[PDB]
Structures are given as structure tokens and as C-alpha cells.
């Protein structure tokens with residue numbers, strides 16, 4: 001069985017929680033805390049291991065952007081530090097290609113990064129790759145067909161509808177068709193042949209809308225909206241369904257977990273996180 005792991009997030013201050021949801025029975029397990037509280041991080045999985053990447057500790061007595069990469073082994077229920085990134089990256093996005101982790105964009109104080117770097121677990125090493133064409137924080141990242149997509153975010157001045165694609169073998173970024181909606185701090189994932197962008201902030205309002213990019217048609221199409229408007233949601237895929245976790249609706253830090261069924265084009269509530277939070281990291285791996 002596989003679990004949806006949520007790491008970190010924010011309510012009143014950045015959080016250390018690691019919790020695992022089992023779709024097969026509705027259950028939540030609390031697991032070993034992160035060593036350092038963090039919101040605005042990303043999660044990903046490589047070789048069964050769960051990684052927490054970047055973020056920021058928003059704490060009553062200091063705010064510290066994170067360059068940290070930390071590894072959770074479900075077999076041991078322990079977090080281990082890995083090599084740190086070149087730079088702190090709060091409000092980060094990440095994607096895995098061929099066993100390597102791409103850390104994309106994010107902020108360090110008022111610095112809005114266009115830089116991108118790549119972690120190799122076998123060497124425990126980060127290396128910079130070509131920067132994005134746009135500075136992006138609160139950037140959604142997805143991998144489809146071994147290409148890396150950076151979608152929306154905030155460039156230091158404007159929230160963005162733009163998106164771009166990284167071609168590893170050319171070490172080159174190129175624009176793709178922009179979304180139909182400006183989205184910063186959305187949830188971005190892949191399902192079948194499409195990149196989904198769910199929720200986000202458009203400059204004025206938290207969004208419930210959801211659109212998807214078909215790489216063959218190069219167009220974005222709206223699908224059914226989520227039940228909740230959400231910015232800084234977590235998102236993942238578990239057995240062919242999109243799950244969105246938490247976020248902020250303009251009023252409440254949501255505990256709502258919703259899932260999307262592409263065949264009926266419907267969103268439904270599936271569970272509730274143990275407490276409302278935004279800016280979590282999310283990924284899927286084996287039970288611990």
C-alpha cells in the first residue's frame with residue numbers, strides 16, 4: 001500500500017509535522033517530525049525515499065529561508081540531512097527526472113530566483129543547471145515524458161500565467177502556451193498526458209479553478225473547479241487520482257483534502273487533515 005505524505009506547512013508559524021494518509025482505509029498516521037519547521041517547501045520521492053526540499057521557517061523569533069534537503073526513510077521512520085542547495089529557496093517547486101531532483105525557483109528574502117539546480121542522490125551533490133527564462137516563486141513544477149515544467153508563480157512584481165519547459169539534453173528552457181489564468185502558489189501535477197494547475201492566487205483572489213495542458217495539443221483547458229478556493233495547496237497523484245491538501249481560502253487555513261476523478265470530471269472531499277495548514281510538501285511512497 002502507498003500513502004500520501006504531507007510534510008511541514010503553516011498555521012500561526014511554520015510546522016514540523018509529518019503525517020501519512022492511507023486512501024485504502026481513511027487513516028492518518030503521525031510520523032517523525034522534521035528536524036526544522038518549514039513551510040513553502042516541496043516534497044518528492046526517489047528510490048522509495050521521501051525528500052523535503054527548501055521552504056522557510058516562519059517562527060515567532062526569526063524567519064529563516066531554507067536551502068535544506070532532508071531525506072525520510074519509511075523503513076526506519078527517520079529523517080537524515082542531505083547536501084544543502086546552493087541557495088535558500090522558499091516557495092519552491094521540485095520535479096524528479098531519471099532519479100534526480102530539480103529544485104526550481106523560490107525566494108531568498110527579496111531575491112526571486114530564476115535559478116535551477118539538480119540533486120544526484122548517489123553522489124549527495126547539487127549542481128546548477130540552466131536558469132529559467134523567468135524568475136518564479138510559488139512556482140508549480142511537473143514532469144511529463146522526462147521533461148520539466150515550471151508553471152505560473154510570482155516574479156517579484158507580477159503573478160504569472162506564463163509557463164516554460166526544460167529540455168535536459170539541451171540544458172535549455174523554452175516558453176510554452178500560457179495558462180488561461182494567472183496562478184501563483186497553485187498546485188501543479190501530471191496525470192496521463194496533461195499538466196494540471198489547480199488553485200493558486202491571481203493577484204486579487206484565491207482560485208478554485210483548474211486547468212490542464214495537453215502536451216500534444218499545446219493548449220490549456222479548464223476542467224471542473226475544486227470545492228474550495230485555495231492558495232499554497234499541496235498536490236499529488238495516487239493511483240490515477242489527483243489529491244489536493246490544505247491551503248488558504250482567504251479566511252481559513254484549510255484541513256480539506258479533495259480528490260479529482262478525471263473520468264467523471266468531479267471533485268469530492270475525501271478526508272480532513274488533522275489540522276488546517278497551508279504551504280505543505282506532499283508526495284507518495286510505501287507505508288513505513
Ligand SMILES: CCCC[C@@H]1CCCN1C(=O)[C@H]1CCC[C@@H](c2cccc(-n3ncc(C(=O)O)c3C3CC3)c2)C1
Pocket residue numbers: 009010039040058091092137138139153154159184185200201231232247248278279
Ligand atoms: C508567513 C506568511 C503569512 C501567512 C500567509 C498569509 C495568510 C495566508 N498565508 C499562507 O498561507 C502562507 C503560509 C506560508 C507559506 C506560504 C506560501 C507557500 C507557497 C507559495 C506561496 N506563494 N508564492 C507566491 C505567492 C503569491 O502571493 O504570488 C504565494 C502565496 C499565494 C500563496 C506562499 C503561504
Ligand SMILES: [Cl-]
Pocket residue numbers: 039040056058090
Ligand atoms: Cl512564506
